[PDB]
């Protein structure tokens, strides 16, 4: 049985439980990460940690471990589970307090680390818009994911593998759990991150694009751009690079993964084979 | 030790815990209520349950109890704890599934019920952060995604406020971080339409009291100009009841003491909580 | 073969054609109506005419017939086709001018009248928003219907019989071609018309609701209201009252037409049997 | 008499007519282009066709000609009319179907090609009506729904303007009613990003000329403040080419005469239309 | 020479000047009113004063006079100039401070009251030609339009558009595309015998507007306070605007378009006559 | 007593007054500048003048002085008061007209120049405590924030919030939720060694801001002009604001939250020192 890190103890999965009084559970008042181990090494471990700490700062939550201790803890929980290929979900919550909202009454944050062993998508645009930048900033990878879940429920009902959000301005934002890229006449465009999330996989992809010297723009786009694109793909830690071959039932290109997307998938695979922090 | 209802079992508080795999924890993927018991009667029990079932429907969650069984579970939890004056927090979550978002992989929801035992105004401040928008995370869902509200509270804590007041994206007043808002100006009471806030049970009772008293009343969008020129402000909710707001953004509301109308509504509300409700021990 | 009214001539359907230089065709620069004849009488003929003329005024288009002459023309084209149960599509365009946009160069509007013989809907909310009140006012029943068509294309791809628009504020607007009503705990709500279209069928329905003394509100609503509604229906000249029994795959009530909706359908049917202008 | 291309036939202008059942007429359900021929060569023929096919794809319309065949049809229509200096208007519509909206009932699109034979600035005015929004009726589609643009022109006609200037809902400058917009301020040229307007072929040529001349250039959102303080303004499009704007909202732009930079771009553009294009008679 | 009230002193017009350091001047940091005297009586004097004090409260400015003392000051300045028919402009400013924004550094508000002695033209025959402006009304959460403040550049910019674009009157929309008001007057429309006017939130809670609604309800004309848009303006049977200085002004053309027959409408004309009657029959006696 | 330039005359401060009928006073209808003299030299004098003339053009106001005559007037008013270190406030107003809004009825603008003799405190140690305000910045299509106008009540309202809410400095968002600026200073952030500042569209095209970007590019610090939001502010390593009066001011706390260690950051401190050097080495000689 896999062990979960809970505040420094390793607890079997079936017994890994949090107080119902934890503000993480009552109010989604916490932050989280998603990280992959490939063949014994943790891909972009430090970058993910840095984002976690930034998100914690945004919600005014003090993580009770230094960054190095957090990295050790992630590594120790993979070893304890004897994992080499894994998805890792670190979570930091506000902890318990009074029953109300007030985070000043919550003296002890809680730290959890879950480790689990490890043709394109039909995407649909959803009616629901992404969380606004001045209500629930979407750059926060928080435990408030019901915006994302409502979009997923739409896609499930409407013939889609993946939901695509616009923002309130009508700009394309992202998928429900992944950043979005388009290819047109050989130029790649992706939205600026402000209205979506500063994806680590997106950042790797951009480095690859610039190394391949493929023309690239970070620019807001709309429905006209999605429906006229030669290729679409989405990016994220779990999905990696995933081709999107239909959009609202419309065929993208010939309906199979495009040339630029398949090229980047191969380069991305190479980076995951060659980089990372050693677990053992 | 108080006991927590958990899927039909009564569990000591200290051991009342949920799987870290529950999407309620992972994603705030659930709904909740807040209910008061006053001297052995639950106030507005059925209006709370009905709202819970509406919010669950909006997030496409089937609660695995009939409404009648939910009512019985709440009353039984109160009884097991010997409570007569209490605050009650029902929660329903999506339960566990895959580690990803998709609620279709979540076969079994969790039902939890927490019971706890139970003139100067509030100083309010308006916050920079806007209310969750009606086409992103509709504020009418009393869900476990409460970081909008907590972000507002963090502002109020830093800015000298007991209560944070939200605007929406249009610039319309919305509500407090956990309470609806009313103003009084030249004998007329105005409160925002519920669309950009939440359909409060307390707010509804108060409208009823207003209409009994024949005080002129409007449900209409308002802005900062209205807050800053009001004769009285108050907020409403299950825990706070009716709470006068005596300062706004450091500005004195009337004479800084609770206003004539607010006080009259406070008295009438107290009478309702004394005289109506569902009896726990019967 | 059915005849079409074209500027006072009656022209067989197969030869009923408009100059490609008509600004109606080049730029959708015209207005239109939809009207039903039931058993020899034209339902709300004068109301539809009045709306046509209001829409023409909004686009600064002078209709070259008085209102009475327009009514005569509609009646004459139904008689000429010997119709008793019909859909009528009157259309007024800018006419031809210079090839550019300028309506001042277009001296002669064109008047066309088409007459054709005559479980709920699964509705889906669409990603595209309704035309804005200060860009292309949706109260104009104009020949610019591509907003409406793009929504229809979404619904067709996404498992829907009917598309439902929000506006830019997130408020519910209407269906792609019909007004929307909801029923909850016995109260009926419909949006104010500003962000949709002042439907004649909607107006009849409201009169019926007030005669049945059913609690009613004209109030903006959102997704929360649609997904928690006991009943939904849409209204329009062609559709009449149409029950909506699914919304984004979610069951409305028991998945069959609700009690209040079926009651109004029966009352509406009675009004169409008893009112109208006689054709013969 | 000039002939119009209509689904492969060449029809005298006076008899070139489409079914009143065509959704192009009923609902403006189609796309169009605008193209110039200069001294027996078509300027930017392929960039126009490519845009037509993009706009058709966005409205989910399959044009029943390959791009190469469309190019041949345009050139043949010009030849049949003996034209050398011309304005060309290709149109593709959805064709006829049911009388209702649904494009699935429309089996056969219509292809039409119209050919016509072919220093003081414009007075511009800003209009009240905003540009069609990017998530309602995306302005980048050169569709037959042009009433947004005609409403603007009606304003300009009533308000003393040769050209109407749109803002978008954010308050950003968008474009003219049928032309893109550029400003010049202290030696730098700025033009809006295309998202809230239309990806003009003329605008693209002009950016190329700007970059050849090494004049500092920005693609950036601008507002009224920028228009009202500009040293020069000009608009661009196939019919107008580069048109100086010498007044804005009655305010004089520079000295009221076309500006130094605008004039230099006008000369360079004229050279391109003289020297590049697809030959009609070859 | 007319006298201007200036903090209790009465100063000839030509000498009535304020320090260049008054934040009223530097920053538009103050509030104002517009009130009319008709035939020796001040119309809605106490209502205008109540609004002044609310606007002041909104900008966190304490007016150093009781409401009753302000009413006496207005009446006194009228008497000292011997006026029977007049327009009155009370102004309260923040006063002088440091050069910076901060109102805490400003100890002493200035109170000024200007008093000055109807538009030429047969308003039963000839209305205003209105244009809708590109600029939008100041937003309810940036510079709330309900404040009758010295910040009137939004309003002046709209007037400049109108001046340039062949209008006598500028009409604002708000950011939502809802009709707001004219540059200085609330707006009403009439359609199929029903009168509509926007809620006041996006414009200003006009006292003339309020009087007109009272007259409307007396006449039993169907009435709606609702948001409206361009479609409503362009299809209206009648349009008029309202405010203290101009009273009820018909709008007979909008953005080119003829309203009705291009003359003031029947409803408008009836309201104009009733309003003028109202101004003869009510008011606070100056003498 | 210091003298104030007033349409060519030099008037002692205490006598420097403007008519209550000047539309500058009634309506905030005018434009201004803020310029500093350091050690006998005026810093970016011609740039400030160019901005004044652009703001005037935006509000359709013709300044009745050539740019060169305006430069001489500023220099002259400094010399007449014998200043070496000073803050200069040129103002141009619409002038007097009729009582109404209409700027056509206003024949004669007023030109005023105020000249007055650094914030107390170790700015290498102690920064500003900033709060984000509920009120949004004036919108780009209602009252364009790029205009340095006499309509500063949006800015004063934000300051009032800050005063009440424990801030030294108010920070505005715009209607889109993008960070705009402080109430009177542009804003910069620093994160992982990259500096970001908003495009000027939703705020004001600051001259201090422009100087700072020049210094940044000299230092080869990575730099982005991009929109940003609350997430960016709350996670920034450093924050500072910029403007003529305050120069470069570190912001060490935002809405409760400690920025870095609560002291001015390394990048900020380097820019402050370089900026001060710049102000010693450039400028138009007064004498
Ligand atoms: C985690 C996440 C992403 C992608 O981030 P990576 O760092 O590539 O895994 C994108 N969007 C949302 C909403 C997410 O939660
Ligand atoms: C629960 C709640 C309310 C008010 O609810 P009552 O039903 O009166 O307890 C108001 N606003 C928010 C955000 C809430 O969560
Ligand atoms: C015609 C129309 C309606 C309904 O109008 P009726 O007068 O009931 O037929 C609603 N919405 C749209 C978009 C329409 O075109
Ligand atoms: C066609 C068009 C343009 C400019 O196009 P060119 O391709 O340069 O002819 C600009 N705006 C609108 C609205 C248009 O229809
Ligand atoms: C004063 C004013 C009005 C009209 O108010 P009255 O009280 O009727 O004089 C309307 N709009 C604006 C902007 C105003 O300043
Ligand atoms: C003057 C001003 C600035 C700063 O500009 P500087 O030219 O650097 O003095 C920034 N914001 C506002 C609102 C201002 O008035």
Residue numbers in the entry:
A (entry chain C), C (entry chain C): 3 to 120, 130 to 291
B (entry chain A), D (entry chain A): 3 to 120, 129 to 292
E (entry chain B), F (entry chain B): 3 to 119, 122 to 291
Text of the article:
Branched chain TAms (BCATs) catalyse reversible transamination of branched chain amino acids. The subunit of the archaeal BCATs has a PLP type IV fold typical of other BCATs, D-amino acid TAms and (R)-selective ωTAms and consists of two α/β domains, a small domain and a large domain connected by two inter-domain loops. A dimer formation is required for the BCAT catalytic activity, since residues from both subunits in the dimer contribute to the active site.
The GEO1900 holoform (internal aldimine form; GEO1900_holo) and the unproductive complex of holoenzyme with the keto substrate AKG-(GEO1900_AKG) have been determined to 1.9 and 2.2 Å resolution, respectively, in the trigonal space group P3221. There are three GEO1900 subunits per asymmetric unit, which form a tight hexamer with 32 point group symmetry with their symmetry mates. A PLP molecule is covalently bound to the catalytic Lys152 in the GEO1900 active site (Lys150 in AF0933). Apart from the Schiff base formed by the NZ of Lys152 residue, the pyridine ring of the cofactor forms hydrogen bonds to the conserved Tyr156 and Glu185 residues. The PLP phosphate group forms a salt bridge with Arg53 and a number of hydrogen bonds to the main chain nitrogens and side chains of residues Thr212 and Thr248, and the main chain nitrogen of Ile211, and two water molecules. In the GEO1900_holo structure the inter-domain loop is not seen in the electron density for subunits A and C, but in subunit B only two residues 120–121 are not observed. The other residues of the inter-domain loop have higher B factors than the average B factor of the model. In the case of the GEO1900_holo structure the conformations of the flexible loops have small differences between the different subunits. However, these are likely to be due to crystal packing effects. When purified by high resolution gel filtration chromatography the native molecular weight of the two enzymes varied with the GEO1900 approximately 70 kDa, indicating that the enzyme was a homodimer with small amount of tetramer in solution.
